[PDB]
Structure 1
Amino acid sequence: EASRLGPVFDSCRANNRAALIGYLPTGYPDVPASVAAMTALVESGCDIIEVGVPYSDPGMDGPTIARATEAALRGGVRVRDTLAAVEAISIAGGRAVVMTYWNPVLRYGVDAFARDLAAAGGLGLITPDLIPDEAQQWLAASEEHRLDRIFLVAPSSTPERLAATVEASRGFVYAASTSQAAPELVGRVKAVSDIPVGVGLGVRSRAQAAQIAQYADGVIVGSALVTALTEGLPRLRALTGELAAGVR
């Protein structure tokens, strides 16, 4: 019955705070450095880590994340490096989901990717360009391998489509935005489901994270963590400590 990330959002709402959800792309600036950084997120107080699979044609991603995934692909990152990253995070006591565009999953084999993500300790999959309309195979693999399925909603989503997207999600719903559009979008999910909702909104600071923990169950942060890692791993830890303290 219960989702894989359910106990994490339970634990957060019992402690009067939102989950801090941190994205980094595998292979930036190289594969070992990216695992070292994902490990440092667990150590610095990230509740859930989004391990990004670099893709040659990312539609949804902003410029910081896109340059980083481009650099990663120039360095030879492979889809298997993402699964190794998920393994290392799990062993260090962290909670990992994978964020990926669908074609790499298709190339791997949907069933096989879910099997191998589950075997690595991964808890779920965020699917920025898979909609429930095309998710038949994924739904089955998700249920077979006990993985959460985080589909995205948007400000533009119709009432019909938003309800279907929430109904097809397990763990949390990613409310992707791109000032009062984020909270309205979250409100609309809440009126039809008790599933946790994660909000990403180019968060840079303690103050901005706190602003989002007021209405959202999880604060998602990607760009800023990648900018921070580029300066250095020490800078990433300090920033992650600021963001962990903001969600409380």
Structure 2
Amino acid sequence: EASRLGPVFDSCRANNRAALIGYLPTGYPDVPASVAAMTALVESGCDIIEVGVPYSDPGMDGPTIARATEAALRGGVRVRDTLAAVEAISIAGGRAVVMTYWNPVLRYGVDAFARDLAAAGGLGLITPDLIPDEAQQWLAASEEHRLDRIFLVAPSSTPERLAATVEASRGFVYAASTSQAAPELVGRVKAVSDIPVGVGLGVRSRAQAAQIAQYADGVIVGSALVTALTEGLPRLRALTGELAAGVRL
């Protein structure tokens, strides 16, 4: 009945804060270095980790994440490396969902990928190029293997499509928006549903995270974590510490 991420957003709202949701791509700068970074997010205060599956044609990603995923693919990263990362995070006590474009999932086998994500301790899937309209197989696999399904909404979303995307989502809805567009989009979700809402808005600072925690249930950070890891692992730790404190404001 309850979603897998339901308890995490309960714990956050009980402690007067939003959830810090941190994205990193598998295999950047290489596979072991990327797992050390994902484990260091759990140690540094991330509540949920988005494990990125590098894709050769990531249309919704900007050049910070795209160049990292290109480097990861040049280094020979494989989809299976993403499931090993999900296991390393779970064993370290963290809470992991996967963000992936749909073709790698189709190529794996949808049912097979969901089974194997579940067996790794993975709690859900974020699906930026899968809409509920094409999600028949995914809905079946999601129920079967008890994974959350985080669909995206946008500022342009029609009233009818927003309600349906929200109704098809479990765990949280990703309000993607990359001044007042983000909080209005969050308001439009709240008017039809009490499902948690995460907001990505190119956050790079403590102050930016605090502003988003005032209305959104989750603060999603991606690009800035990748930029930090490029400088070094201690820069990632320090930046994650600043964001973990931002969400408590």
Secondary structure at the counterpart of residue 204 of structure 2: coil
Measured against aligned partners, the alpha-carbon deviations of 1:48-88 in whole angstroms (never above 9, x if no partner) come to: 00000000000100110000000000000000000000000
The CA deviation at 1:235 is 0.3
SS of 2:22's partner is strand
CA contact (8 A) 2:229 2:236 kept: yes
The alignment's TM-score, normalised by the length of structure 1, stands at 1.00
Q: What displacement does 1:94 show?
A: 0.2
1:119 maps to: 119
Q: How far apart, in 2, do the equivalents of 1:177 and 1:234 lie?
A: 29
Show the counterpart of 1:182.
182
* Secondary structure of residue in 2 paired with 1:46: coil
Q: How far 1:7 moved relative to its partner?
A: 0.1
2:51 equivalent in structure 1: 51
The structural deviation recorded for 1:209 is 0.1
Instruction: Look up the match of 1:16.
Output: 16
- Unaligned residue ranges in structure 1 (runs of 5+): none
Query: Do 2:26 and 2:82's aligned partners in 1 also have CA atoms closer than 8 Å?
Result: yes
Task: For residues 97-145 of structure 1, give each alpha carbon's deviation from its aligned partner in whole angstroms, at most 9, with x where no partner exists.
Answer: 0000000000000000000000000000000000000000000000000
CA distance in structure 1 between the partners assigned to 2:247 and 2:178 by the alignment = 22
CA displacement at 1:178 relative to structure 2:
2.8
Q: Match of 1:30?
A: 30
1-structure distance, mates of 2:60, 2:239:
24
Structure 1 residue 25, shift from structure 2 partner = 0.1
Other structure's SS at 1:51 match: strand
Structure-2 separation of matches of 1:133 and 1:77:
30
> C-alpha displacement at 1:152, in angstroms?
0.1
1:90 CA drift (Å): 0.1
The RMSD of aligned alpha carbons is 0.3
Is the Cα–Cα contact under 8 Å of residues 199 and 218 in structure 2 kept in the other structure? yes
Structure 2, unaligned stretches of length 5 or more? none
- The 4+ residue runs of structure 1 with deviation greater than 2 A are none
The separation in 2 between residues aligned to 1:246 and 1:131, in whole angstroms, is 32
Which residues of 2 match residues 24-173 of structure 1 at below 5 A? 24-173=24-173
The residue that corresponds to 1:219 in the other structure is 219
Per-residue deviation at 1:198? 0.1
Q: Distance in 2 between matches of 1:42 and 1:11?
A: 16
Q: What is the Cα deviation at residue 156 of structure 1?
A: 0.2
Q: Is the 8 A contact 2:118 2:146 kept in 1?
A: yes
Q: How far is 1:2 from its partner? A: 0.1
Contact 2:178 2:202 in 1 (8 A): no
Distance (Å, rounded) in 2 between the aligned partners of 1:156 and 1:179: 15
| Percentage of matched positions with identical amino acids | 100
Distance 1:94 1:61 in 2: 25
- State the secondary structure of the residue aligned to 1:171: coil
Q: Distance in 1 between matches of 2:23 and 2:80?
A: 18
Q: Which digits, 9 at most, give the CA deviation of each residue in 1:150-196, with x for residues without a partner?
A: 00000000000000000000000000003100000000000000000
Q: Distance in 1 between matches of 2:237 and 2:219?
A: 17
Q: Deviations over 1:181-227 (max 9, x none)?
A: 00000000000000000000000010000000000000000000000
Report deviation, 1:45: 0.2
3-state SS of paired residue (2:20):
strand
Give 1:242 shift: 0.1
> For this pair of structures, how many residues does the alignment match?
248
For 2:122 and 2:190, the matched residues in 1 are separated by 26
